[PDB]
Amino acid sequence: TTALVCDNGSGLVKAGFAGDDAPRAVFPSIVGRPRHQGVMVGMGQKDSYVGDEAQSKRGILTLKYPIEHGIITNWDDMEKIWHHTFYNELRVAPEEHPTLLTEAPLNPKANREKMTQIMFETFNVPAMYVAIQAVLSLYASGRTTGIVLDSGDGVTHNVPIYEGYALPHAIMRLDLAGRDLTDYLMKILTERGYSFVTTAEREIVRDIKEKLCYVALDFENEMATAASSSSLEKSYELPDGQVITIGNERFRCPETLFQPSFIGMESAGIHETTYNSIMKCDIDIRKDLYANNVMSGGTTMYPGIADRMQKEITALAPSTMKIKIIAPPERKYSVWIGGSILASLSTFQQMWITKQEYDEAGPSIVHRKC
Amino acid sequence: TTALVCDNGSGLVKAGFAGDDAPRAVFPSIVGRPRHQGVMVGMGQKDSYVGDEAQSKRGILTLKYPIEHGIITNWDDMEKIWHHTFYNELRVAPEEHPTLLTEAPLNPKANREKMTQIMFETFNVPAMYVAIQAVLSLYASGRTTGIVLDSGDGVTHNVPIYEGYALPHAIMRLDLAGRDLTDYLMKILTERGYSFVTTAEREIVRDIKEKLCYVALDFENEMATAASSSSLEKSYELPDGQVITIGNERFRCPETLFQPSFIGMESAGIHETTYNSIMKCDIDIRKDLYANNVMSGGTTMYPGIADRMQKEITALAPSTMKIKIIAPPERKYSVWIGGSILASLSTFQQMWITKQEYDEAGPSIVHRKC
Amino acid sequence: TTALVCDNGSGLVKAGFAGDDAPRAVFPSIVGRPRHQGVMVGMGQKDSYVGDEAQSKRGILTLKYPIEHGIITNWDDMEKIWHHTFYNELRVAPEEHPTLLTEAPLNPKANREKMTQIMFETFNVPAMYVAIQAVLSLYASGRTTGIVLDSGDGVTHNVPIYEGYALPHAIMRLDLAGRDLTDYLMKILTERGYSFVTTAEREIVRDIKEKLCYVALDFENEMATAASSSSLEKSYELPDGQVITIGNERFRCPETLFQPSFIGMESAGIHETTYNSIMKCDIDIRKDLYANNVMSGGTTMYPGIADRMQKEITALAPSTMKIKIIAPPERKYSVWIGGSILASLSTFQQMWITKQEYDEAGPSIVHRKC
Ligand SMILES: Nc1ncnc2c1ncn2[C@@H]1O[C@H](COP(=O)(O)OP(=O)(O)O)[C@@H](O)[C@H]1O
Ligand SMILES: Nc1ncnc2c1ncn2[C@@H]1O[C@H](COP(=O)(O)OP(=O)(O)O)[C@@H](O)[C@H]1O
Ligand SMILES: Nc1ncnc2c1ncn2[C@@H]1O[C@H](COP(=O)(O)OP(=O)(O)O)[C@@H](O)[C@H]1O
Ligand SMILES: [Mg+2]
Ligand SMILES: [Mg+2]
Ligand SMILES: [Mg+2]
């Protein structure tokens, strides 16, 4: 009778059971299909690969992400992803496990309705629920009041909560996250002569970004430092043994979070978005929001991002405001951890969307229960 | 109901039954016709000789190869060859044996279509199939990943397969193989005063090449070694008792595979062709191609060719790539062995081109079934 | 005091003086070196040939292209090319002529820096400038708004400009162009029995492609038409008098621009790349980009390419968008014509990189002036 927690991000699936501290399985949410011709008979050559097996065979596949900026764009591939999650990774039967799902705020309603319908009809779950990922990150923190910035592969969002009450008019959503940083790193890696163009070579660039990239405390000083000397240059070995070297692409890629105009966007950086979200809240709750800046997600995992956020929000806010950025070492899984905490609570047990409620009230049950 | 496997190379016919480990018969694919005048009545003096009987009587015949660089140029002589194979060597009736045939990649389509037509009309086979020889060579080695370098009398070709998927854009074909090496050995044997000019004397030079020639690990060092001393000189006894001696023609002949400019070709050597074929494949599959270099065919049978290929590809590839050359002792028949393995599989039984498909869909069935 | 305009493409050099309507000289950017042995004394047998003289003597040379996908890979041969351009074709002294050079977008920075250094040190130009070829193509058409699809021997690129402002985040670059089409035509010409393998025979195949190839309005219909009848077959006479015939290779070769998977690439066709470039631009500027599709370069010179681009972009775009493809009859020289127009303007005269700026600011002047 244990509940399931599935955190469907744009880039990774974090799935497990409620009551744990880490997910069962964490695998990329990709579906790969062969793009060359098979010449050997049989071999169990399947027509599509999901998750880690698609990354294993990615040299002969075309990798597709069913989720795009927090929105599911391919629903057959997403059913493939969910079937993989339930049967090959969790190795469970979804007929007896309530499933907690997550979603970004300010998302299309059809996304939520269709997840509800697929859970209740394709996978026959007894109950389900869709929770906002930033509220779950606050549950993982253990703090009732915080402003949460969640940055994932697809979306960056700010949700300010005070005493357990959210201020939905102050919620920010920015469609700039890890995948845009990967694409920008590809583009600026072309400057040194490195050409990554295929979907399989997007994973190599994502690995380069996760290993070698960091957030500069002061961008212009680091640009001058990289110009003067090669102290910031690091090498990376490609899957075929070729070695690439990057000097200032290491901090130019994550700078797009603070200067979105690098990729041609008109928006403000994550620091200015956070400050604007705080300033749309009530004046009496702003001090507690300044002191509680919870960062979650994999795009907040850069070395130096918390210090840079500290510096920028301190510059924006008054001098008597006491700015703290809470960046737990496990913030790459804060949404899943908070979802496990929430699904394990006794008070939450009356808040599931039951199967009978779905049957006798339609998929639109999800907008008024969640 | 057993299937036939006929490997028609430019130089030799390898024919047998599926399920065996070696072909029934291996004979030269030559048709000899007398060039002098008959003076004795009768004797069963036939107008043409095929296979081993043409080599037996080659002193009074003009030997012709119906296949030239993997392409059948004389179709009447090729029907003679196939009739010999079926009736005098296999001693079977082709009306009840499906026949698996082999062909080099990047070959004229008319070649394949006309083999299909002759099999289905002249020999009345119940079914047939044309397979690429490098895929068959990969079947024999028992693996589904690797780049195959197949060298025969007529063509040398590279086909990279990964997980059973071929990359047809990375397939190389080089029209330099054993027959070009035989001709070059004739030409450079003229340097010591030995004149072989006739088609029958081409077989003597081919025998010299198969017995005395080897691949030098370092060409310039071996050239210096042969210049300094006579330690590399070996003798060969001609059919009439004359003894010839060759010192550096032993490794100068096979060096044409690595330096095609010896015979006036502009192409790259087999090592550089293999490296170029690997580098036209996806970056994620290159490590497994480096570690799996399958060599098949009779022109890869030189002493020291695998070590030289190891050395050259190691020089071309990065230092962290782990280069292996797989050169089985039976690689002179890898194509036939793999064809037997393929024709014996149960999954392949639905992939034959049946007689009815040919009748009601034309000879062009072979491009979309094979 | 007239300025020079040198359009260095991967395949051809277009050089001339600013203010003209056509370049002085258009010759292949190849350097040929003899591959056989000289037996006649003297003759002025030079060790290397550049341009038209290499194509004249290509039967005894190995032709090398110093530019490869818009990137200069051999710099000594490129200095040979530039010296030829300046002294044997333009017959000028570069010490008193500012030189305008062109480059593809998303190119290595070392390419631009080394062209700047060689111009300012080897050829002693008073000033120089490197311009993006698509902006120059937009100069030639006399408009300041439109998305340019420039296809050359080495690179195909999309650059959307609106009101004179470029959107660098929407710039596409595809490393598929005329040379890849020539190689594909060689590969599929092997199907009818025609074997072109040498670098000199690459020019014959390029001539065949330029004379006999066209873009099919509907590929499958043309494939059916070529299968049914021989109405699409045309003959071509080789330099030695042999006549070759091609039926569907005529439109199968240029189809690789719309189906890059023909040569094993994962990218999208030029139509889908153009649509994707338009859709990464602001919603308010998309109507003017749809109506202004400037095509330039020699690979856009196929019969029927503009109509096919019209059809495909119309299929992709909404029905109320008004799609025009602007394909001037002189679009093979749009980059050079636009460069001449730009170098002749009075406003541009303050935008040269002067010699003193180079001397006292390094070769890195080119990234912040251009
Ligand atoms: N150590 C790291 N440094 C920088 N970026 C990272 C790191 N680890 C993961 N990422 C990025 O975070 C993204 C995945 O974060 P995640 O929270 O799983 O997103 P989602 O919730 O959308 O799945 C990926 O795009 C990856 O590039
Ligand atoms: N031991 C050997 N050493 C060198 N060359 C050999 C040897 N044995 C055979 N060959 C060459 O290999 C060629 C035959 O190889 P094979 O694989 O039968 O070619 P094909 O498939 O074209 O018939 C002949 O030209 C012969 O000269
Ligand atoms: N009439 C034509 N039809 C098709 N292709 C052509 C034609 N004329 C030239 N080309 C191709 O265009 C390329 C040269 O175009 P160009 O604009 O000069 O390129 P670059 O700017 O790279 O020199 C050559 O590869 C040639 O094959
Ligand atoms: Mg997330
Ligand atoms: Mg063979
Ligand atoms: Mg050009």
Numbering used by the authors:
A (entry chain D), B (entry chain F), C (entry chain E): 5 to 374
Authors' text:
The transitioning of cells between migration and adhesion is modulated by α-catenin, which links cell junctions and the plasma membrane to the actin cytoskeleton. Outside cell junctions, α-catenin dimerizes and links the plasma membrane to F-actin. α-Catenin is highly dynamic and functions either as a monomer or dimer. Here we report the much higher resolution (2.8 Å) cryoEM structure of human dimeric α-catenin bound to F-actin and the 2.7 Å cryoEM structure of F-actin.
To determine the effects of α-catenin binding on the structure of F-actin, we determined the 2.7 Å cryoEM structure of F-actin from the same grid and data set that resulted in our F-actin cryoEM structure bound to α-catenin. Therefore, this comparison is directly indicative of any alterations in F-actin resulting from α-catenin binding versus using other F-actin structures derived from a separate actin batch that could be used for such a comparison. Superposition of the actin subunits of α-catenin bound and unbound actin displays a root mean square deviation of 0.7 Å for 2888 atoms. The smallest and most flexible of the four actin domains harbors the so-called D-loop, for DNase I binding loop (residues 40–51). This loop changes its conformation upon adenosine triphosphate hydrolysis and mediates longitudinal actin-actin interactions.
